[PDB]
Amino acid sequence: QISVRGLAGVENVTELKKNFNRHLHFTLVKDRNVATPRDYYFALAHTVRDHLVGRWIRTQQHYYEKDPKRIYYLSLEFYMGRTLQNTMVNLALENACDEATYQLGLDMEELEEIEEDAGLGNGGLGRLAACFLDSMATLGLAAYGYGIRYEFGIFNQKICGGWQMEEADDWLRYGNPWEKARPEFTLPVHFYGRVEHTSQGAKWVDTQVVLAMPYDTPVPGYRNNVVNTMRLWSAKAPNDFNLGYIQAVLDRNLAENISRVLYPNDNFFEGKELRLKQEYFVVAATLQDIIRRFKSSNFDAFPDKVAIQLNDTHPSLAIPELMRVLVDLERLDWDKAWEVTVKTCAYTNHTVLPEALERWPVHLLETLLPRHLQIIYEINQRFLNRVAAAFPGDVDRLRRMSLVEEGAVKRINMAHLCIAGSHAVNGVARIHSEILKKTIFKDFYELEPHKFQNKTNGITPRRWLVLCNPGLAEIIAERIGEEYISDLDQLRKLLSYVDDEAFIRDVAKVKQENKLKFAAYLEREYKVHINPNSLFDVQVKRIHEYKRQLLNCLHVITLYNRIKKEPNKFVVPRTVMIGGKAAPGYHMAKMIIKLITAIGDVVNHDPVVGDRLRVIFLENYRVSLAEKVIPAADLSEQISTAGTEASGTGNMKFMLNGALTIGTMDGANVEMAEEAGEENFFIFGMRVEDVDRLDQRGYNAQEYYDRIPELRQIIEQLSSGFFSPKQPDLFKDIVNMLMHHDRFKVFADYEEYVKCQERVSALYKNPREWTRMVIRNIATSGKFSSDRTIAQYAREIWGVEPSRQRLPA
Amino acid sequence: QISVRGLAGVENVTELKKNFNRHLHFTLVKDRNVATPRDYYFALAHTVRDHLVGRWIRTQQHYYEKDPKRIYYLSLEFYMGRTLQNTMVNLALENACDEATYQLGLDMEELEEIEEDAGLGNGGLGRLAACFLDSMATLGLAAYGYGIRYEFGIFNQKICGGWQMEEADDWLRYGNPWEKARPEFTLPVHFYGRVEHTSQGAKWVDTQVVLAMPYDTPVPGYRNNVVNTMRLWSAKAPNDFNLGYIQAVLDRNLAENISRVLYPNDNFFEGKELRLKQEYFVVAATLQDIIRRFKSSNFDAFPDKVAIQLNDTHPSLAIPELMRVLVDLERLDWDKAWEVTVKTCAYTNHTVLPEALERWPVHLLETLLPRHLQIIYEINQRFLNRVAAAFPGDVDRLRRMSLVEEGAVKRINMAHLCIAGSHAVNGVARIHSEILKKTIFKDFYELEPHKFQNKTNGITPRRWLVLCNPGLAEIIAERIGEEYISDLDQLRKLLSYVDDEAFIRDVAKVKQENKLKFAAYLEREYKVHINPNSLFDVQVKRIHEYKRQLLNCLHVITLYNRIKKEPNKFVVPRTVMIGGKAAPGYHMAKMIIKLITAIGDVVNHDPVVGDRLRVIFLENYRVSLAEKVIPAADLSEQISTAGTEASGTGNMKFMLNGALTIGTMDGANVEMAEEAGEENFFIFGMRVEDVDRLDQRGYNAQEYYDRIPELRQIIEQLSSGFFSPKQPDLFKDIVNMLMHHDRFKVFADYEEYVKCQERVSALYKNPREWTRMVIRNIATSGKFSSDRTIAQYAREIWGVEPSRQRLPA
Numbered sequence A, B: 001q002i003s004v005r006g007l008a009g010v011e012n013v014t015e016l017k018k019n020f021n022r023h024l025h026f027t028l029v030k031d032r033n034v035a036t037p038r039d040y041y042f043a044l045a046h047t048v049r050d051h052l053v054g055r056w057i058r059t060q061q062h063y064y065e066k067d068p069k070r071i072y073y074l075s076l077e078f079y080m081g082r083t084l085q086n087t088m089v090n091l092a093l094e095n096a097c098d099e100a101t102y103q104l105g106l107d108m109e110e111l112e113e114i115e116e117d118a119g120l121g122n123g124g125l126g127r128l129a130a131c132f133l134d135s136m137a138t139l140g141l142a143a144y145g146y147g148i149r150y151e152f153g154i155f156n157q158k159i160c161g162g163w164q165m166e167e168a169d170d171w172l173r174y175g176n177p178w179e180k181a182r183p184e185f186t187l188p189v190h191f192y193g194r195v196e197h198t199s200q201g202a203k204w205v206d207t208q209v210v211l212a213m214p215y216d217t218p219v220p221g222y223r224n225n226v227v228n229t230m231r232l233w234s235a236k237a238p239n240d241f242n243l244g245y246i247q248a249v250l251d252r253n254l255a256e257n258i259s260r261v262l263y264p265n266d267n268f269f270e271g272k273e274l275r276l277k278q279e280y281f282v283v284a285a286t287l288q289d290i291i292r293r294f295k296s297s298n299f300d301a302f303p304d305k306v307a308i309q310l311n312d313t314h315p316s317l318a319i320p321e322l323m324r325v326l327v328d329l330e331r332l333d334w335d336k337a338w339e340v341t342v343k344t345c346a347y348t349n350h351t352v353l354p355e356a357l358e359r360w361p362v363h364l365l366e367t368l369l370p371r372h373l374q375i376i377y378e379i380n381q382r383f384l385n386r387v388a389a390a391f392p393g394d395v396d397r398l399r400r401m402s403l404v405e406e407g408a409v410k411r412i413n414m415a416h417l418c419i420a421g422s423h424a425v426n427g428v429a430r431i432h433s434e435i436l437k438k439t440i441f442k443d444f445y446e447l448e449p450h451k452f453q454n455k456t457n458g459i460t461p462r463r464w465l466v467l468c469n470p471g472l473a474e475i476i477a478e479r480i481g482e483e484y485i486s487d488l489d490q491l492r493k494l495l496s497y498v499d500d501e502a503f504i505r506d507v508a509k510v511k512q513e514n515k516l517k518f519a520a521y522l523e524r525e526y527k528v529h530i531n532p533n534s535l536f537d538v539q540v541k542r543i544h545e546y547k548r549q550l551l552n553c554l555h556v557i558t559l560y561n562r563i564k565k566e567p568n569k570f571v572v573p574r575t576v577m578i579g580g581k582a583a584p585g586y587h588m589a590k591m592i593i594k595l596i597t598a599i600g601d602v603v604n605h606d607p608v609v610g611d612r613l614r615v616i617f618l619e620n621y622r623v624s625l626a627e628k629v630i631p632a633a634d635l636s637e638q639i640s641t642a643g644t645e646a647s648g649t650g651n652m653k654f655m656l657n658g659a660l661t662i663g664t665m666d667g668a669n670v671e672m673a674e675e676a677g678e679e680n681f682f683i684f685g686m687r688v689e690d691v692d693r694l695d696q697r698g699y700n701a702q703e704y705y706d707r708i709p710e711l712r713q714i715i716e717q718l719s720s721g722f723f724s725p726k727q728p729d730l731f732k733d734i735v736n737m738l739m740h741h742d743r744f745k746v747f748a749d750y751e752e753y754v755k756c757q758e759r760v761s762a763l764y765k766n767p768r769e770w771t772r773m774v775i776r777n778i779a780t781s782g783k784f785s786s787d788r789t790i791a792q793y794a795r796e797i798w799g800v801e802p803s804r805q806r807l808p809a
């Protein structure tokens, strides 16, 4: 059909059709007369997977012969989504498979919709891991993703009576054709036990053993014939485990529970034992694998051959585990082992929210990992000795910088352990990296200024342009060719088309087609009727007080009250769509979902409103729903309180896909606005500086309520039961929080938000100028490619050169 | 190499080699330089599985078009063993795969040794199920095996210090290439709840739902291109299950535990809830499948289209479940539903041991299956009304025949439920079926004499001759051709070779080769040195008091005491091998293993004995060890107390493979002796009649101890610590049982056993006459083919004609 989807050669199509029928027969043991769409999806998945195998074996072979420096990306989360379309895109197979499926009488797009998301992450951090794997493969880096093969990923979200219900994400029920079990590379992981001290040093004894079985998933680079590995560990019990008889076999599940379920909290630490077991399990199995590979290339060369990147503190135990292996098992002296550990490890910080920072109780580490606690205390003593020598007499600094926090319960500050044990610490957007140096890590910065870097986040333009928005990919490729897909900076060439009438028409046409296709998707799968000629106002991201879905709710209720006051006045029609999951135990996030649906129940059924205002809660927001709604969006809502959103990556997805942004100067929004120009961005609200000034004098919500009549009306509607007729007091927790305990200062940004939202409506009245501003955004989105991000990690942290040069086919 | 293994055509071998390299690359994602024997076994397994697929799809297709009567074999146990060699044998692929593997530089026999046994049974009953599936496929019957896909089969047996230790049989760790998951045919199974009575009859409500997911394994017939299905159910939780959040996901394991582990008791009932859940789970999922198939062919035709065979009482709930579906869901009247149920169901009884008969407490059925208890009580009332009408005033008969047993706890007698609900009840050897009519089922026989049949057990000559003993298969095929493999009665033609010198030499040569090959297997895998010129005295079967391993131990200690008394006299050298697992909770069986190893520790290290007497405990006796030792045996020990071994099938395996039998007139031993001639069999001991006569007057073990000096010496050796120097009283439980509480009358058969064992030694001194007696046994083993057994089930119970006619290829 379209050029960027590759060639449909006669030999290629014939060969794909024959392998599809071979897999249907031999692999699936189905004849054509009883095969379901699911059988057809699986036959296609096996057929495309076949094109990976040769490339995967050769790539791993090449890394054994060349022995380059190896990058190990340790994450507890990989938010992968679907693999089929991504594999076809990266192997240039998409048009050939479309053609081959069409000739067998099937619709490939309908087969793609059958694949389950690999939902092994919560949101931004897990999805950053997935974008990074794709960029590392595209840039020809000898990179490995290491994590946990959770049996249940992020829960499926159902809305029942406007409330979130959670269902188990049984993503493996029908099998995973993309993973290969490697039961032969199964490794032991130790828990509990005690430390004996001998003449020959410390010994960890009387441990419980859990086996880690690896599952390898291929990670294809963009048309470079490179296929890297994501290795995920599954927990298995040993066969002597608990070995009356029946109960001993049934109790094997205590051990296998380690890899059973992803913790579903975004930016919230829960100090549970099972979570600490998950953290050690991935770190222990992964470091044995790293060391095995290194010994098949003394430990002085380890950091020339190994980089370990820590995705937040979740795998921070990699630092004491590497010390334990180097000191206790390899018998290196402390100082040499520490040198190797620091040069090997690098720490990416993703948050400043205090309740998200990992602080493990000592009694927990004492029971589960006694030797790691000893090594952590030893790290702390030698670290505090360097602090004392550099800042003599500064006793408050010693208390603040300690890895051990004193109090009710002693805690380990895992962030402090990562800075001490890493040669590089980075934040994930320039303002976030500046805030790390000025606030939470100020003391560490003053000791070791050299460790602190910025690596601004990015997104892969493969999944987030070519895959989700082929029509936009194509009109761009019509003008400037295909090269931009692996060199996004080339999109700047689009600034010379900002006054080209045909290009303006094509950009608006693709947006309109994406909106029709998504409006129809809503009708088919969830029986809801939306005006496709309305402005698509989209806020999709996890439900969080800091992301201020509530600020958006206040705007929606304002528009509603303005329509009801002046029913017969023109307003730009909007479809306001909000989606995201709340953590199951996060009461306020569950109330916010319920408020969103309750506003919808009132606004969507008022005949005076008509099709001028619609409020839709998008159910089960996940990677595959993001691929559908983001290409359909006109307005991107990035409205976090200044200083709370470390980066965001949603923001980038929307910029790439032809939506204008309304946002605060938070996270990468600052850099997006700098790249596009402030005049091409709907910036409103407090800067970081303004929030600090408000904090010094005290945030009084009552002040905003007394001075803004439009705001007081909304709070009185909420209180009195305007939106909950049967349960008048349903939303009292929301009102009470907005009036007395709002950490994120929702009212402080209300006036400037509504005014700025009026400026959005005004520009939307002028299609041509709206589209010209969209072109200025797409044209300057190049910086926000994960290829740029990874090239910066490679050069400035890992010490390796990226390469766009192809392996042979 | 040998003819019965089929042709190695040039095109066939070339094609197998190419598919083996295709599977190594594409399926296993290995290059030849890192592949292990396990990778090579898997590549071969995938290559042979490919030859099944076409035949499997066509067979199932043929059954849909022809719509023949369908046979459903319901068993809680299928003791399958390894699949690779069996598949090759049945598809005539063995020589072609040997050749193809040889040319790729691999040894196929070494690859076969890598396959795990499917150990989803305890012993004879589970293995009878497996032999039956093979015969049903060979006789072209539209037959389905239905059971449970246990995650852990019968435990792996380790001997540590002469004691049995159990290890979890993790048979699925490396994957099962033979099964195909069918997650699309997943069915709900209900537990707990309560019964509401409405106007429209009884309703089972507020149940817990467990999902049953089927896994299909192919069952190939012998070169007839027929491939039947064994369908095994796995327990899965629904996704709303328990739906704080984390614990709800972890608690999914309560539901999935149903299919986790095979109960490891042979001939011992344990009334545990988890076991009752296993029984309902297979019956509920299976009857929904049977009914779905039937409705794609009113219920008057059900029994013309459906036979359900119950493998003992373990699936007895099939009877009330079919009533429940027919009465509660299909709305048939009681009498019509009952007619259909009786004509559909048939019950095979396998035991008379009281502690093996299933008697479920009512409080258990009341909680778990409330509606099935109501239906069982209703069955009992109408059954007892027919008993009362036939035997008016016979109130004791009413109490004895009741499905409900009164007492401390009310129990359901599941055997009584099966006779009432079945058109046919059979035992498994003629003497066993006679004992059913005279003792435990006398009352039922007098009511419905027509229901009671014999179907003498058999073994498949595919696994138990061609597969395990190719050299014997071949010398037979040299004289009489290959036809006997699917018509074992043809072995009678071997009686015309009983005086042929060349055939005598070939039979003795194959036995000698099998003994060398097994002696070498012992040395490699378990570092033990055996005289291959000795008589191989083998007792392999589950460890049980009724099977009298202890009688054998007394003989071994007698030979030892006779050697020590007269060291310089000639005795026929023996290797005495005993193997079998004890149920983990069966104290006395664990002591017997320990006694066997303790005798070995004394006998094997006495320099005066030399290589004249060896006692070996064969570790981890299972189907794959039976395939090795049974072809190596000279003497088969079948020494159960008369009336206790319902049939036995080991006995038959050994008769087929060229061992003479020493045994009691028990089980199929009676029929084996009748077929071969009493003069060609080492018969000793009490008949059933003699045991009864002893029971009437009282079994006094002291009488035998007072009169047999050789016996008194052994009991004094056992007591005093001759065999346990460090723990003098180790075996007091054994002595105490033999002297005061022996239900199986070990001493009563001692004298006649030793005398008969002297007759065995005497014939072994004359190789030619030993071999001539072996030929008379092999020659008359035809009756004991499972093809004969299944043809009898088909004609006399199921109402279908077997067929040896091939499906097209």
Ligand SMILES: OC[C@H]1O[C@@H](c2c[nH]c(-c3ccc4ccccc4c3)n2)[C@H](O)[C@@H](O)[C@@H]1O
Pocket: A122, A124, A125, A128, A265, A266, A267, A268, A269, A270, A312, A350, A351, A356, A357, A428, A457, A645, A646, A647, A648, A649, A667
């Ligand atoms: O850099 C990628 C994105 O990372 C997000 C993040 C920070 N912390 C977490 C997180 C996730 C899971 C956690 C689980 C347990 C404990 C803390 C946990 C913190 N996620 C951050 O909010 C967003 O601005 C960035 O764009």
Ligand SMILES: OC[C@H]1O[C@@H](c2c[nH]c(-c3ccc4ccccc4c3)n2)[C@H](O)[C@@H](O)[C@@H]1O
Pocket: B122, B124, B125, B128, B265, B266, B267, B268, B269, B270, B312, B350, B351, B356, B357, B428, B457, B645, B646, B647, B648, B649, B667
């Ligand atoms: O007909 C095949 C063979 O079946 C054997 C049998 C009888 N009962 C059981 C058994 C097995 C498992 C059980 C599990 C639970 C409760 C009772 C259980 C009874 N197994 C029988 O001893 C042998 O003579 C026959 O040759």
Ligand SMILES: O=c1[nH]cnc2c1ncn2[C@@H]1O[C@H](COP(=O)(O)O)[C@@H](O)[C@H]1O
Pocket: A057, A060, A061, A064, A293, A296, B031, B033, B034
């Ligand atoms: O001893 C070896 N000989 C040849 N190739 C090897 C050897 N060890 C590893 N390789 C190759 O290196 C790849 C990577 O293995 P890994 O690094 O252990 O995951 C393997 O799949 C092989 O292709």
Ligand SMILES: O=c1[nH]cnc2c1ncn2[C@@H]1O[C@H](COP(=O)(O)O)[C@@H](O)[C@H]1O
Pocket: A031, A033, A034, B057, B060, B061, B064, B293, B296
């Ligand atoms: O509706 C149908 N059309 C054609 N073939 C069918 C149909 N239903 C079942 N079959 C065939 O019958 C086989 C047995 O299916 P089962 O009896 O449901 O396990 C299937 O695998 C098909 O080959």
Ligand SMILES: *Cc1c(COP(=O)(O)O)cnc(C)c1O
Pocket: A122, A123, A124, A127, A540, A541, A542, A621, A622, A623, A626, A647, A648, A649, A650, A651, A653
């Ligand atoms: C990109 C993405 C996110 C992160 O979005 P933010 O707006 O940065 O919070 C979360 N969830 C999914 C499914 C995503 O694709």
Ligand SMILES: *Cc1c(COP(=O)(O)O)cnc(C)c1O
Pocket: B122, B123, B124, B127, B540, B541, B542, B621, B622, B623, B626, B647, B648, B649, B650, B651, B653
């Ligand atoms: C045949 C067989 C049995 C049954 O043997 P019996 O001597 O009849 O008890 C038990 N276990 C295995 C592994 C078998 O192959």
